[PDB]
Every structure is written in structure tokens, then in C-alpha cells.
Amino acid sequence: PAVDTAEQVYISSLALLKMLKHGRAGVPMEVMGLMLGEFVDDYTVRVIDVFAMPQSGTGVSVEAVDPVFQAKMLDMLKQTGRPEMVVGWYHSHPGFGCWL
Amino acid sequence: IKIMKSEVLRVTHELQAMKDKIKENSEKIKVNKTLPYLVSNVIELLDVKCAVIKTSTRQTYFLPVIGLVDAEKLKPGDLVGVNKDSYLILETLPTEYDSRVKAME
Q1: Which member of A36, A69, B46, B99 has the lowest number of beta carbons within 10 Å of its beta carbon?
Q2: Which positions in chain A touch B31 (Cβ < 8 Å)?
Q3: CA–CA distance from B99 to each of A14, B37, B38, B103, B104 (Å)?
Q4: H/E element, B25
């Protein structure tokens, strides 16, 4: 199988506002956070909420995803009414454009 | 006699909670202290607790906070390892002499 070019990632206004806020707070350094949403179907993934990962010396890496922090945040957000799963991650790229 | 049970239980509980919370805070600080430690000098110290740091990259930045060290144990001219990008002081550095100076002896 394969994915199509028509795949649309839906970013809610709250998610974009939170991501921009975290990015503008992070500068000059790079911050990161986990995206909460749903893979509703194959031709689109929807993100509804996003939460910030506390800054770490590792930077933006696998080790920056604090396991205990992520588990606690997911557990506490599930009680509130957001039982979403982690659809991905975001990280700010100060100065240089959006690439990997 | 009530002070035995009540106070000993409460104080040991606070001791343990504060102890593992201190270990968590210290671990967070240690992991956050990214080792590169761009070497810089404190050109002056001024009250708001704030420092003006000239990095080894020949540029001076003002620091809204001192960082992870104590402002009292600092003065103009000391060598401090600031962050690469945040430029915040992470630890003080012992007096470092250039190789030419050591060869001068």
C-alpha cells in the first residue's frame, strides 16, 4: 500500500495557537511537544490539542520525550475530557525554515 | 506524648516527599545543563542579581537572571560557562591560564 498526496493534516485553531506560543517562548532554542489527535482515516490525520514538553538538555530528540511527564499529562487530560492519542510531535525551528 | 506520633510521622513524610522531589529537581537541572558550556566572562555585575556577560565569541549579552550559580560568589572578570544559545550562566570556572602563559614560567 501507500499514502496519497491528498492526505490532509487538520490542525485546530487551539493547536496552532499553542504551537506558535510555545515556539515564540522557546526562541532562541528549540522546543518540542506531543500532538494529540486522531487518525480518523487514511487520507487525513486530525490533531485537536497539543501540549508542551519541558525543555531538556538533549534538545529535540527521542530522549526529550519524557516518559513519566507524557504519561502523567495523558492521564490527567483523559480525566478532563480529552482522551486523544499521540498523533505526532512538533518542534520549533528558529531562523531556519521548516525542514527535518 | 501526642507529639511523638503526630510530629514524627508528619515530619518523616515531608522529609521523604521533599527528598525525592529534590532528587527530581536536581536530575532535571543536571540533564538540562547541556555540557558544551560556551565559555564567557562577567564584565560587570549590577543589581536588578543581573549580569552582563561577554562570551568568547566577542559579543556581550545582558542576563535577566544570574543562572545556576550565586551572584554573591561572582565579580567582574570571572570565567563562567554559559549556555550556547540561552547564554545563561551554568557554572563557574576555575582560573584558566593560556598555554603561552604557562610556557612563560
Answers
A1: B99
A2: 56-58
A3: 56, 20, 19, 6, 8
A4: helix B2-32
Please tell me the distance from the alpha carbon of residue A26 to that of residue A60, in angstroms, as a whole number. 12
Q: Are the CB atoms for A66 and A53 separated by under 8 Å?
A: yes
A56–chain B Cβ distance below 8 A for any pair: yes
Using a CB-CB cut-off of 8 Å, the residues of chain A touching B86 are: 28-29
SS3 B26: helix
Phi-psi region of B68 (alpha: psi -120 to 50; beta: other; left: phi over 0): alpha
CA dihedral of B37, B42, B47, B50, whole degrees rounded to 10:
-20
* A65 vs A62: CA distance, rounded Å: 6
Contacts with A, B 40-99, CB within 8 Å: 85-86
Provide the 3-class DSSP secondary structure of residue A86.
strand
The whole-angstrom separation of Cα B2 and Cα A1 is 72
Block residue for cell numbers 570556572: B93
Residues 6 or more apart from B55 whose CB is under 8 A from it? B38, B39, B40, B61, B82, B87
A22 annotated as ligand-binding: no
Q: Resolution reached, in Å? A: 2.8
The answer, for B34 touching chain A at a CB cutoff of 8 Å, is: yes
